[PDB]
Amino acid sequence: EKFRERLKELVVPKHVMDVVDEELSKLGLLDNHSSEFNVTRNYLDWLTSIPWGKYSNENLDLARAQAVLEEDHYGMEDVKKRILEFIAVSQLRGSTQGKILCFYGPPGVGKTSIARSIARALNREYFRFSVGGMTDVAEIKGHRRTYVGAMPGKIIQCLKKTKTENPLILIDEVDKIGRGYQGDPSSALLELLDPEQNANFLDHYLDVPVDLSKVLFICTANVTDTIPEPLRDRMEMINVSGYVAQEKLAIAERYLVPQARALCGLDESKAKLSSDVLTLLIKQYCRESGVRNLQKQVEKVLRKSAYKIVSGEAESVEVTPENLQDFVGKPVFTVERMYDVTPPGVVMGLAWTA
Amino acid sequence: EKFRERLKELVVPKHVMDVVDEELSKLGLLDNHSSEFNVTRNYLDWLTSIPWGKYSNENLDLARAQAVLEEDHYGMEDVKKRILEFIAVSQLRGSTQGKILCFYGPPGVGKTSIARSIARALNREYFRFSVGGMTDVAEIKGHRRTYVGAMPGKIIQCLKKTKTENPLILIDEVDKIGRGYQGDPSSALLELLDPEQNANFLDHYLDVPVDLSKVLFICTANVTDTIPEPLRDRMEMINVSGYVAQEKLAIAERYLVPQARALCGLDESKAKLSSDVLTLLIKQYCRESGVRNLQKQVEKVLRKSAYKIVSGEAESVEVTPENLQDFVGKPVFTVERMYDVTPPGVVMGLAWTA
Amino acid sequence: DPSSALLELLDPEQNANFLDHYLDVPVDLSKVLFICTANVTDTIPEPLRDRMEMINVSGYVAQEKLAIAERYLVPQARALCGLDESKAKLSSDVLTLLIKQYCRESGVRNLQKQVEKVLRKSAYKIVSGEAESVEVTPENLQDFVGKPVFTVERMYDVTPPGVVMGLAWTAMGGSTLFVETSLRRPKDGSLEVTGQLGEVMKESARIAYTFARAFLMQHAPANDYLVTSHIHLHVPEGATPKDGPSAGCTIVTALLSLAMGRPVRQNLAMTGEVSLTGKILPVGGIKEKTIAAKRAGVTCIVLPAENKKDFYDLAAFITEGLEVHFVEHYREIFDIAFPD
Amino acid sequence: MGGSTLFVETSLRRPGDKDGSLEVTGQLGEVMKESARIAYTFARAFLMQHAPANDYLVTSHIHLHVPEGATPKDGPSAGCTIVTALLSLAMGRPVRQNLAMTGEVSLTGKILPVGGIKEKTIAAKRAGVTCIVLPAENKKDFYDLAAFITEGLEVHFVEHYREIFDIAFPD
Ligand SMILES: Nc1ncnc2c1ncn2[C@@H]1O[C@H](COP(=O)(O)OP(=O)(O)O)[C@@H](O)[C@H]1O
């Protein structure tokens, strides 16, 4: 009775009901202390827990969505323009729609963080899973229902936790695929990337197909060539470039420093990081195009500041450039370029890597 | 009883009658709670899920077949001729028939798209599965009922979904079949694509053979050299080549642009793309033999036009060559060839790749 | 793997309501602390890596091993073996010799096995009546433990011309490599390189050969050694493979020492990748290279100037007796190696 | 299979400033091939100081081979026996009979320790040799063996090849 009630609100397709109806009869004829009774109970619990016909209420206003995106991140105009165009398309259609987008760029630039901001702007539910060097295809679609202690696929597990059929799905490192031999999960991604095959998605644990359309898919990478040709085909390549030194300071002053201060339990009245000391961190303690390394250095400075105030060394820590060496040590990088005055036969060039 | 009416509608062979009758008596003498019950009912369910002697009402009208094929695709005379000849032969036969066809050509040319159109023209159920990067044989054939979590082959699942014995099964990426260190899966494909052995296709899970004749098998490939000789020898090779710039304009004007407008949700009077814009897009923004990259550019132009309409910048959007850069940016391929004039020692040549 | 089953344990949302399969009622795991451990950072779960704060636990040089064994390992091993301090006595000097010659790994478990073996052998002597009290000396340690694993640390006590000490990184700690050059023959010169040198280190020899040859032109124009003579270069570890550009400056010194016939300073070890112009570039693994220098008993160590942070990121006793020299160009190294 | 003895045999391939060359045959490994080159370079240098008049190892072309042709071989343990073989051929003087030597040799001339001392020592007695030459760093390994594997063997422990030369060529 309880499981029948929990399906009342959902909009279940006909093929879902017959599977549920037939398993209910099997559950009725079983016994309480039967091992397969638990398997039937576990399987039937998953089917009802998955939302059917339930779509989260989207946000279809350009003004508020643009404002939300601007506050969360700095720059990323190429990504922001695409998201604004995504919302406008949904208004003309009159119904929610899904797209497959790709964010490729240097690591730590903001590819993963921007997608979280996208979900809140669209009022969707955020779920993240990584495919860096995948080896088992069972991650995507789970195990077969007959296997003891089997579980549904991670995508199916996403609908249970998100409790809606319109989530935002994030994929990490599509350029770091794992060429498995005993199992190749690249086929599952190609099925998911194909819009025609995306509409009808089937898993091992749940024989019934599930509609994965109208779902906004984000995949992240560093360099596009390693991505397989069938995978680059179905991805909209949105490019996320690196940051210059002055751009990093704006990100650090407005986003990195206030966030790291919050995760350390401090407020702006106790620990203060000057603008010049952040410049010294960027130009000497950082060389990557992203801000991942800079974020760790800011976190480490706040960790030492928190210890100092509690342990009685001070009551308010101010990180001047003079005493920065106490918090982080000697500069990691002291020369911006190997040659300052190139001798004859030496010419500076440019490179581009992952 | 439930399995009985499922076979009452179909026309079942004598040997299938023998297996189902002996297995039906086995269920009656079996224990409901035993693990053998799950294996027996699952296999017997698959027997009842095979549409024995069930055929879709094929479309033998040559006039409508030409209309359906022409109204969904442009050019491809070689493929269109083959389908018309297939229908003409079926009229003389008085019964349905099956063939093994292979479409090979540059990617993004219409090999998969026309396959769906052919099924609509012939009133046949459409099923697609890929063999690209495939290493395990069992997916084609299946596994014995002894093994836990053993499912039938893909072909058996095709009959259950379509509920007919004359589908249009599309096998994609036959030229990129994965080499098997433990066993080549193309060896099992030969039994699938052998006209002599199609009449009796025996798989591991389903002990009874299945008449796989009267099934239109269509295979998709990019280059015919990599396809194994035994597989290539049993198939018919039809070349679907790329289009010239003049043909690309006709495809975009009639098919790509109207389809992208429906996807974005724009009326003709709202967003317009003149032939001059499309000619520029083909010549300078897409260096390809197919119309795949052109499709992405067309979607990009219409997607940006929808944003302008919602934002109120322009009530109706008209795309012209002078303001084309506002939608797609600077041209990509600004030069038709490296040397307008060839200095001594430099000779122009021609190349042909995949 | 059941990594998903561990996600709920480390997910704050699922900690409040821990839905146990056995127990229907949830339990509160929010007020619970979790600590994790790992060994190698390549097979760690990258999807789960973001949740946990990566903390590196470095090993121990022989100084901490003596302190750890004296305070923790020996008293604990003696307690398990049932011995007493008055019966079996392990002095500080023998423990240092045991660590130096038998346990050079960065871990501690191997040191536990050796001390238990000594105590186990000592227990046999007491029970059998061989001796009322068992005492361990450096000469007796071979009988109790067994085979020394590391006997000699300096292949050359005095380096002849053409031989320069270098520093290397190994899994079992540091190692000192020598670079030897000699005349293969009594026109174009050539350099044959032997030893199990990798592609990266073989290229560095070619770069070092070019710079060393060019260095002599601006230093001693009348010296036509490296331009006309055939040189054989070898790193005297035939079996063990060697790679990395860390020996670039060592090769230049060896080539110049052979050309001028002047031996290098007898207690000098140098490290650093050299460029075509002659600029010293930073080299990793400074901690392992510098401790091996102390074991080899060298006084002055030459390092690239870009490695100043790494050298000063070490304990006081590690870099106590070393007169480190930081250089940016090889011209500084040449003066240090050839003071006259 | 309890170790075995090997021989290093060299002979002249051919009867103004052109130099000689060394060709090595036998299924030698990469490490053993490098050891031959190191030994060849040291043998040239050693003969210069010992006998400047001799010009055998500089101009003549020498072929080096290990008679177990079909058996793969590897390791630098044959460094000293290759040097002795080259010097014996150059001087035209056979080495002292019933003498077996092993040990890695650097081009400077120092003898380095080698593994498998137990197997080499057992094979030395099986061939009924009188004197065995080992690196000085292997002194502990030799005396760690059982008592019955040592008697009847006059072992010489060396750290530089110049000690092997006196032993192999007493005069
Ligand atoms: N433009 C930006 N505005 C605000 N925060 C940023 C910006 N760029 C980067 N960050 C911060 O830096 C971090 C980048 O890490 P992440 O983007 O997850 O790495 P990756 O790019 O490899 O996915 C994020 O936690 C984010 O908070």
Ligand SMILES: Nc1ncnc2c1ncn2[C@@H]1O[C@H](COP(=O)(O)OP(=O)(O)O)[C@@H](O)[C@H]1O
């Ligand atoms: N001649 C044509 N007429 C109309 N549309 C076409 C034509 N050729 C290609 N297209 C369109 O271009 C796209 C090309 O994709 P397709 O070639 O089917 O992929 P694949 O190469 O994997 O088979 C199709 O979606 C199809 O709608």
